[PDB]
Structure 1
């Protein structure tokens, strides 16, 4: 019955295709399967996971601070594909390489592999459990820290949630396998980060408080975000119990000359170690990383070569090659970086359907300040609205919109707000002057932000815009969550357990709390189709070719051999019959003809 379920899924995608791939491009028919590198044989040298375990978070931080080598964080398992491949990368390909990281690059600080779009996308678009993924990575790399990006007021959700819910998620994330939480707030508002950070500490894990970088500190024309801005925030975040301070350059804006300044300054402002995350949209982020290294930053992020560049992180292989031999040499085998990268390359070719059209670096990023992770996404949305040939006007509108909102920090989900605004502005051919003129029906998201739902920026919201937009509704300036009733967690669990006619795990409950509808759908899908996550990627998105033989591991130990022998015409009752051979035995599966 687990196999029967799988056979049904396979029968379905074989006959109807996967909705996410049905009309996008296919992978080159050649299709050289990704091969996990054969590893030497030895056991695993202890790494940071062991260290944090022995030292606790406060003392681990002090260890990073004092470490001479630069520490590296690989974002391939998360930010890399979230930017390049619409986060569509599957547990099957991610889990399979965790052990090779463990054995080959034990000196890595952490693996960014959870949070961001992954939580929601995995259930919604890949029919797989984000928890199962974390568990598998954990099991494969028990010597490295596992890192997530955590969204502060939302957690990993899409809305605001009562505090106990955020608190509950964090406890589960920790239990689940996460060691290092990079928590950020879209308006860099410390008051809105407190609940989160407290929760991370209470779980005795690493609280990496992030300051989001925007504007230009070396540009006196734009004083709103100067050096003092960040250093103060660092002091504030330290006082709020951070173990690590992080500079989250979501749009890839930090320029090398600024890095030299910003990182000298931050190390002087706080005893806490500093962690630098950036994006390579400019095509110069590596310069910035290296500057930050030279200027004494403690840890930086990079992606594997085969998923680096552009809206991703800059190239991990080359940053390492640059640092090799130097006093701050990170101590990582390039042959191994290369071999893992080749794996990633082969893995990537499977995801052809989710490649964007971006051709290379763009200094335009310094104008629009679109997050690397929003860029493609907003471009596709622009095509949707029939604006493909005005994309640069969209970009300009975004810049203008930003300034109109008072020059805000643009990241999830504030950057979505500016997006929506820009798109409307071009569609409806409205200027800023037009927008704030004394009739516009503003986007739901803009109304919401201005009401106060995404928090408050340092100088508040522009009075005039806000009045016009809110159209009567009185705006608030307290912490958004402070106004939401504490959730009755027991009743809300009863709700899901009745709907699914069974008990759920704490993790499943956590998922439900963040994404009630997506989770519900996924649970139902699961009951129907079985543990589809065990299928290799091609089979998952494309089913099986006529004649094709597939090996699929249903339950560790047990391997099913499945052959697509034949596919019937569509019968009077609208059904197609796929003729399989499961482990040498005939099986006939009926699925509906969805066409």
Structure 2
């Protein structure tokens, strides 16, 4: 029956294709499968996981602060593929390499491997459970901190949730294996971060409170986001209970000379350790990261070579190589960094369907300030709307919409709002002047909503005139969104999803439902038809089995299925197709609909 269910999936995708893959480019037909590097069998060294369990988060941050070497966070398992492959990387590929990281790079601070768009995308587009993914990683790397990206009042969603839901989720993330929570608000509104921060502290995990970088601190013609804006935020986040301060440079806008000034200042204004996250859209983010190490930053993020560059993080292997032998040498073995990068390279070839056409660095990033994780998304969206050839006008409109909104921090969810506004302005051919003019504009939902106050408040408030015109008579609020949401009745809502599914659910599954009621529901129902598809290797997940193909699938840690596609019938008079399989040497037939 689980076997039967998987055969059903395999038949369905063999006959009909995967909706995400069928119409897109395909991997090279030769294609060597990824090979997990050889393990010497020696046990694993204690790392930052044991230190945090031993010290607790406050003393661990002081240990971080005092540490001479720069500490590294690998983002390959989350931001890397979120930025380069629409977050489509599968558990199967991610979990198989965690043991290798654990034996070979036991000095890493953390693996960023959870949250951001992975929570949603795993279920919606890959029919897999992000909790299982984390558990598998936890088991393979017991010595390293597992790090998530948590969106403050949005959790791992897009809307603000009620406080008790946010707390309920943090608590389950901590139980499920997350050690280090990097938490951010899309407007750097400290007030809107406290519920998250307190929940993290209550779980006794590391609360790395982020400040999003935007603008340019060394440009005096844009004083809004000057040095003291950042240093004051760091002082506030310390007062509000952070263990670590992050600079989250989501669009890769921080320049090297600015990093040098910024990280010296941050280290003097707060006693907390500092952690630097950037994107390489400009082609020079490695310079910014190295300037930051030289200026004393305690940790920095990077991605494995094979998933670095452009809108991802800059190259881990090369950054390490640049530091090798220096005072802040991170003590990471380049040869293992390369072997793991080769694994990721072969992994990534399986995901050709989701590659963008981005060719290289673009200084244009300094104009538009689109975050690395949005840039490609928004370009596809523009192609959807018939705007491929105006893409540069859309980028200009994004920059113009930014100023029109007051000049804001742009990062999920607020980036999305600036994107929609920009696309509107190009389609309907509007200047800033028209959008504000006393000229009807049917503003997008996302924009009305922000101006009402659903994403929070920026420093100097939303612009009066534009807010007036978009809201159309409706009154805005300036209080914290979550302060107005009804407390959910958890007992009750648990009973709802459990009635829907005709079965009890786990606390994790309930946390999923709370974050994504419909998506979790659809995923639960798909899991029920198709069984544990996460266990299939990637080619088979996306493309089924070629004629006569033999596949080995590990359905439980113990049990291997040997599955052969022996034949496929024509479509019968009822629109069904029968796939003839051999399953462990036994004949099986599965009918699936002809979805053509």
**TM superposition score normalised by structure 1:** 1.00
Q: SS of the residue aligned with 1:259?
A: helix
Partners of 2:158 and 2:412 within 8 A in 1: no
Shift of 1:157: 1.4
* Whole-Å separation in 1 of the counterparts to 2:26 and 2:238: 49
Task: Report the 3-state secondary structure (helix = DSSP H, G, I; strand = E; otherwise coil) of the residue aligned with 1:69.
Answer: coil
Q: Distance in 2 between matches of 1:156 and 1:318?
A: 31
**SS of corresponding position for 1:218:** coil
Mapped pair 1:239 → 2:249: no
What's the offset of the Cα at 1:160? Answer: 1.2
C-alpha displacement of 1:41: 1.5
After superposition, the C-alpha distances for 1:377-399 in whole angstroms (9 at most, x for unaligned) are 00000000000000000000000
- CA–CA separation in structure 2 for the residues paired with 1:41 and 1:495: 48
Partners of 1:324 and 1:367 lie apart in 2 by 34
Q: CA deviation at 1:31?
A: 1.1
Deviations, residues 398-421 of structure 1 (Å, cap 9, x unaligned) = 000000000000000000000000
What residue in structure 1 maps to residue 254 of structure 2?
254
Matches of 2:522 and 2:28, distance apart in 1: 32
Q: Secondary structure at the match of 2:159?
A: coil
Cα deviations by residue, 1:494-549 (Å, 9 ceiling, x for unpaired)? 00000000000000000000000000000000010000000000000000000100
Distance 1:310 1:401 in 2: 24
Deviation at 1:39, TM superposition (A): 1.4
Deviations 1:103-133 (A, max 9, x none): 0000000000000000000000000000000
Q: Which runs of 4+ in 1 moved over 4 A?
A: none
Is 2:244–2:272's contact at 8 Å kept on the other side of the alignment? Answer: yes
2-structure distance, mates of 1:23, 1:136: 31
For residues 484 and 474 of structure 2, what CA distance do their matches in structure 1 show? 16
CA distance in 2, matches of 1:118, 1:443: 26
2:177 counterpart of 1:177: yes
CA contact (8 A) 2:72 2:301 kept: yes
1:35-434 matched pairs, under 5 angstroms: 35-434=35-434
CA positional deviation for 1:375? 0.1
Supply the distance in 2 between the matched residues of 1:570 and 1:486 (Cα, whole angstroms). Answer: 52
Helix, strand or coil: the match of 1:562?
A: strand
Distance in 2 of aligned mates of 1:225 and 1:440: 30
TM-score w.r.t. the length of structure 2 is 1.00
How far apart, in 2, do the equivalents of 1:390 and 1:48 lie? Answer: 48
Find the aligned partners of 1:491 and 1:413 in 2 and give their Cα distance.
29
C-alpha distance in 2, partners of 1:162/1:424?
A: 31
Hey, what's the Cα distance between the residues in 2 that align with 1:159 and 1:280? 28
Deviation at 1:40, TM superposition (A): 1.6
CA RMSD of aligned residues (A): 0.3
Q: Tell me the distance in 2 between the aligned counterparts of 1:405 and 1:564.
A: 57
SS of the residue 1:165 aligns to: helix
Give 1:227 deviation, angstroms: 0.2
- Give CA-to-partner distance per residue, 1:462-519, whole Å, 9 cap, x none: 0010000000000000000000011110001100000000000000000000000000
Task: Give the secondary structure class of the aligned counterpart of 1:430.
Answer: coil
| 1:203 to partner: Cα distance | 0.3
- For 1:316-348, what per-residue CA distance to the aligned partner results, in whole angstroms no more than 9, with x for missing partners? 000000000000000000000000000000000
Counterpart Cα distance in 1 of 2:162 and 2:296: 39
| 1:174-227 Cα distance to aligned partner (Å, 9 max, x none) | 000000000000000000000000000000000000000000000000000000
Cα separation, 2, equivalents of 1:422 and 1:357: 21
Structure 2: how far apart are the matches of 1:422 and 1:235? 34
- Once the two structures are superposed, residues 130-155 of structure 1 have per-residue CA deviations (whole angstroms, 9 ceiling, x without a partner) of 00000000000000000000000011
1-structure distance, mates of 2:82, 2:162: 27
Instruction: Give, in angstroms, the shift of residue 573 of structure 1.
Output: 1.1
Q: Deviations over 1:275-326 (max 9, x none)?
A: 0000000000000000000000000000000000000000000000000000
Counterparts of 1:534 and 1:418, CA distance in 2: 39
CA offsets, 1:85-109, max 9 Å, x none?
0000000000000000000000000
Deviation at 1:158, TM superposition (A): 2.0
* Structure 2 unaligned spans of 5+: none
Tell whether 2:562 aligns with 1:561: yes
Per the TM alignment, residue 354 of structure 1 is displaced from its structure 2 partner at its CA by 0.2
User: How far apart in 1 are the matches of 2:66 and 2:106?
Assistant: 19
Count of residue pairs the alignment pairs up? 595
Q: 1: distance between equivalents of 2:466 and 2:3? A: 58
Deviation string, structure 1 residues 25-46 (Cα, Å, up to 9, x no partner): 1100001000000112200000
Whole-angstrom CA distance in 2 between matches of 1:398 and 1:161 = 27
C-alpha distance in 2 between matches for 1:350 and 1:83: 16
Q: What SS does the corresponding residue of 1:417 show, helix, strand or coil?
A: helix
